[PDB]
Amino acid sequence: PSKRSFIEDLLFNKV
Amino acid sequence: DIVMTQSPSFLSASVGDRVTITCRASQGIDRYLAWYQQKPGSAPKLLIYAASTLQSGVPSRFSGSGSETDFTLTISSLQPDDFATYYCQQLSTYPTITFGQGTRLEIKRTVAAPSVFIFPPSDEQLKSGTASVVCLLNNFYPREAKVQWKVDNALQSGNSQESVTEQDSKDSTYSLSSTLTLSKADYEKHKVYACEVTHQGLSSPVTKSFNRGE
Amino acid sequence: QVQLVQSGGGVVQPGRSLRLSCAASGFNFGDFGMHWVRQAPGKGLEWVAVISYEGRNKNHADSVRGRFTISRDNSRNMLYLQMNSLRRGDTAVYYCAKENRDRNYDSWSASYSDYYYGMDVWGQGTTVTVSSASTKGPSVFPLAPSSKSTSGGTAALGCLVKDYFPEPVTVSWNSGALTSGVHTFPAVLQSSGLYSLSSVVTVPSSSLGTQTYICNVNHKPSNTKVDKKVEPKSCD
Ligand SMILES: [Ca+2]
Ligand SMILES: [Ca+2]
Structure with a gap:
């Protein structure tokens, strides 16, 4: 498994 | 932001013809490119995603190809239902998304003076x-x-x-x-x-x- | 059965604000990101905003950042767009759209299944007209057919439908007895902020001055109804 919260946070908040 | 450039802006064809419309990204977008069809007064309809895979329900005469910066939509045997405006869309820079400017596919006929x-x-x-x-x-x-x-x-x-x-x-x-x-x-x-x-x-x-x- | 149903647009003045609604059903709404896309009259699609499955993350296009806010209420299957500081350039049809999931995955599989694969289901669209103009019924003027026996057989006549707000108007001819060869052009937006269009029709030359031609113009926002007779301009 892998958290959608974790992956989406990085996706929407990357520089 | 990535700019998507479709070509041509307008083009004419008759039923049975093959039609190719292209779309170019201002930088590489891998294969994260989608194509849509739209008729006046209706919402756009998703035709192809990930550059080449056909959306369920879409006739097989539609096909997509391309990668990195150059992409094409091909309709292989034009049907009356196909005359419409077509848009590409890149999703590589998700969560920001951009569209191409659109291609209008109209019906060819003989010249007629006004x-x-x-x-x-x-x-x-x-x-x-x-x-x-x-x-x-x-x-x-x-x-x-x-x-x-x-x-x-x-x-x-x-x-x-x-x-x-x-x-x-x-x-x-x-x-x-x-x-x-x-x-x-x-x-x-x-x-x-x-x-x-x-x-x-x-x-x-x-x-x-x-x-x-x- | 998978569907998005929009409501809530209309006419608003610049600077003011509007909230668009989009009711989803037939799918697990809270499992998917949702988007707004708009299309200004006669123009292409422009992406507007995206919101993540549970509302925590969101992004807006530069053209609307700081004025429009996307939001969602998953307990009521609702998507919203809050549109503030409205400009005439925000005049468009607005569509909500569900994020497409790659067919080979039945559940969320990060970038394998979601985000990158377009938008599969769309709302019906909502019209938003941002304008200073106030409701005004049209004036209707004849496009009188020329005296010149030119062509031979066929003459053109019509009606100029000028200075109304907002869209739409409907035009018929001879209360529906004349439909063949009728062209009613799309409206143009004039410098004044008021709309204008012409409706024309081609008729036999010989019918000029022997048959009656009436354009029937209706403007529901104004409750304006006009029946304008169109006849050759009798010369002095
Ligand atoms: Ca765009
Ligand atoms: Ca979330």
């Missing part, structure tokens, strides 16, 4: 301070047409607006209006109003005109 008509402003409208002069181009093909207003033989600019109908459902022609708007005082001080039409189907430009006051 019938041209000119209409002076009514007396009723003049009684309110403004004069609209209308030039009508009727049932022509293809769409490209040049309409030049001339007032007392002087070329007009910046005071006219054009409007064009959708391609006709039965005979595949277009019609077009050009409306020259002047104030009453301006319209009264000139005599000859002329509309000059250039089109592929005309071996010389057609002029229709009237003299104010006949």
